[PDB]
Amino acid sequence: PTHLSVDTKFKTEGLCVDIPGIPKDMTYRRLISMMGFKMNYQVNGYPNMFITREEAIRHVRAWIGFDVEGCHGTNLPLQLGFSTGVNLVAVPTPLMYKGLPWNVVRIKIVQMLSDTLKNLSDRVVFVLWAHGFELTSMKYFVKIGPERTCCLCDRRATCFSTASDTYACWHHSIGFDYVYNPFMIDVQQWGFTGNLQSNHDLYCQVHGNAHVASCDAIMTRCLAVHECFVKRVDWTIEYPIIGDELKINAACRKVQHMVVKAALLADKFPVLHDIGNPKAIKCVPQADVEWKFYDAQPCSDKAYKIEELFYSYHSDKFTDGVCLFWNCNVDRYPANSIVCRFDTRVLSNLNLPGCDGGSLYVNKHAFHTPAFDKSAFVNLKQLPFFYYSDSPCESHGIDYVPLKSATCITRCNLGGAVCRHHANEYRLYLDAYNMMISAGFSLWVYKQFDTYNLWNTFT
Numbered sequence: 445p446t447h448l449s450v451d452t453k454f455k456t457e458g459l460c461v462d463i464p465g466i467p468k469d470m471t472y473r474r475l476i477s478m479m480g481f482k483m484n485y486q487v488n489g490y491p492n493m494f495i496t497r498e499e500a501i502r503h504v505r506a507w508i509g510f511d512v513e514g515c516h517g518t519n520l521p522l523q524l525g526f527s528t529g530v531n532l533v534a535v536p537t538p539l540m541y542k543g544l545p546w547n548v549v550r551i552k553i554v555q556m557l558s559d560t561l562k563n564l565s566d567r568v569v570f571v572l573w574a575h576g577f578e579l580t581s582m583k584y585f586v587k588i589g590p591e592r593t594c595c596l597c598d599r600r601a602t603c604f605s606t607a608s609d610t611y612a613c614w615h616h617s618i619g620f621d622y623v624y625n626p627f628m629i630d631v632q633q634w635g636f637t638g639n640l641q642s643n644h645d646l647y648c649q650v651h652g653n654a655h656v657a658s659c660d661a662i663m664t665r666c667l668a669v670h671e672c673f674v675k676r677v678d679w680t681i682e683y684p685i686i687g688d689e690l691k692i693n694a695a696c697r698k699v700q701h702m703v704v705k706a707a708l709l710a711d712k713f714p715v716l717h718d719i720g721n722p723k724a725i726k727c728v729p730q731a732d733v734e735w736k737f738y739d740a741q742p743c744s745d746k747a748y749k750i751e752e753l754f755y756s757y758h759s760d761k762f763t764d765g766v767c768l769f770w771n772c773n774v775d776r777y778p779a780n781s782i783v784c785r786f787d788t789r790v791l792s793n794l795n796l797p798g799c800d801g802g803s804l805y806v807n808k809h810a811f812h813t814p815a816f817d818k819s820a821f822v823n824l825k826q827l828p829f830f831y832y833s834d835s836p837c838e839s840h841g842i843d844y845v846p847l848k849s850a851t852c853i854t855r856c857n858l859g860g861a862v863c864r865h866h867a868n869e870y871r872l873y874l875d876a877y878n879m880m881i882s883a884g885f886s887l888w889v890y891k892q893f894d895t896y897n898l899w900n901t902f903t
């Protein structure tokens with residue numbers, strides 16, 4: 445049981461208004477044939493156009509919500525909506541484009557999917573709330589066959605060109621006109637009572653229904669994301685490396701050791717309350733402090749209420765010392781805290797749009813993160829950049845331009861001139877810090893944090 449069997453049953457109740465008289469008994473095999481596609485008993489890596497929920501979760505980077513609304517069905521013009529906000533109108537002869545034939549519409553579909561997916565995935569997954577028109581319209585822009593490779597590279601083929609009879613991935617498909625071997629999943633097959641808007645609005649207030657095809661496409665992918673990543677969580681599923689993942693994660697570990705070590709030197713807290721990761725390690729292992737851990741998994745729905753995490757009767761007094769919340773998203777942080785909060789609004793290849801203002805952050809694992817709220821940090825301030833080192837000024841073993849910086853907190857800078865070792869280390873740390881901030885993470889600290897207090901750790 446790897447793929448979705450074509451002999452599985454497809455509930456056709458949701459299809460009978462666009463398609464009256466549809467057989468209640470339907471299989472994927474028969475539905476595909478009804479859609480105008482000939483699978484021709486092909487044992488070449490594309491066993492089914494439709495996929496399982498497990499396969500869709502593993503390929504979430506490829507999800508594109510798709511909806512078709514019949515404006516006037518052979519004689520009538522269709523509105524093609526995608527979760528990218530695009531609305532295309534096809535004639536048979538929230539970006540709303542005017543009526544054009546299928547030969548030009550398919551050119552736009554390939555360009556749009558390619559520009560959206562080239563840096564995220566090796567495929568497309570049309571996430572549907574199937575009523576009929578979207579499945580019947582697929583023959584006008586989709587071609588199927590064996591699994592292929594690109595005409596210009598080793599990546600799998602996702603596009604086809606009738607002009608040249610060639611195949612291409614999302615990176616090399618300029619001027620291609622057909623979507624090749626796409627995937628799809630119908631959310632209605634999951635078992636819902638009622639229409640799309642009623643199920644969507646149960647969990648999300650950020651997406652509305654302007655009554656265009658793209659609005660339903662968005663609500664569809666959002667409802668799919670809530671079901672697969674908000675209400676259900678699976679942090680065991682690994683995801684491929686598609687960007688700066690390894691650099692971002694290494695930067696996060698360097699920043700955390702730096703920021704926490706400096707707070708313990710500047711304010712010498714006797715106890716640190718580490719709230720978050722049940723698998724956490726002491727990020728400053730040589731520190732004197734009483735390190736106490738508290739387990740809390742990443743909240744995917746709503747941010748943790750500080751009352752439920754702390755109270756109900758540990759040192760008991762979280763007011764003693766400092767509380768470290770490294771990616772532990774709470775509604776309002778206590779004033780004595782060190783905090784790393786992921787900003788869900790950040791635009792990147794790792795951050796996919798989520799449910800109720802939240803986002804799906806995919807870095808090794810998929811983490812649905814609640815909406816970034818600036819009010820969570822009223823008792824704290826933004827942590828400013830600084831680099832601190834108490835290592836000896838020894839070069840050992842790139843070239844050099846003298847470093848002049850007020851934020852290089854070192855004995856050499858105290859003494860008047862940054863040594864080459866600390867200048868290399870400072871610039872490497874500044875790069876790691878910038879990496880992490882640009883990845884979307886934000887750093888917050890208690891209002892009394894002052895880097896001026898670190899100069900006296902050199903006596």
Ligand SMILES: O=C(CCCc1ccccc1)N1CCOCC1
Pocket residue numbers: 720721722740741742743770771772773786805811812813
């Ligand atoms: O980057 C991460 C994972 C950090 C690791 C972790 C944090 C808290 C509990 C268990 C594990 N996230 C994205 C932002 O929201 C929070 C989770």
Ligand SMILES: [Zn+2]
Pocket residue numbers: 594595596597598599612613614615616
């Ligand atoms: Zn290619």
Ligand SMILES: [Zn+2]
Pocket residue numbers: 644648649650651662663666667798799800
């Ligand atoms: Zn939504």
Ligand SMILES: [Zn+2]
Pocket residue numbers: 836837838854855856857862863864865866
């Ligand atoms: Zn030095």
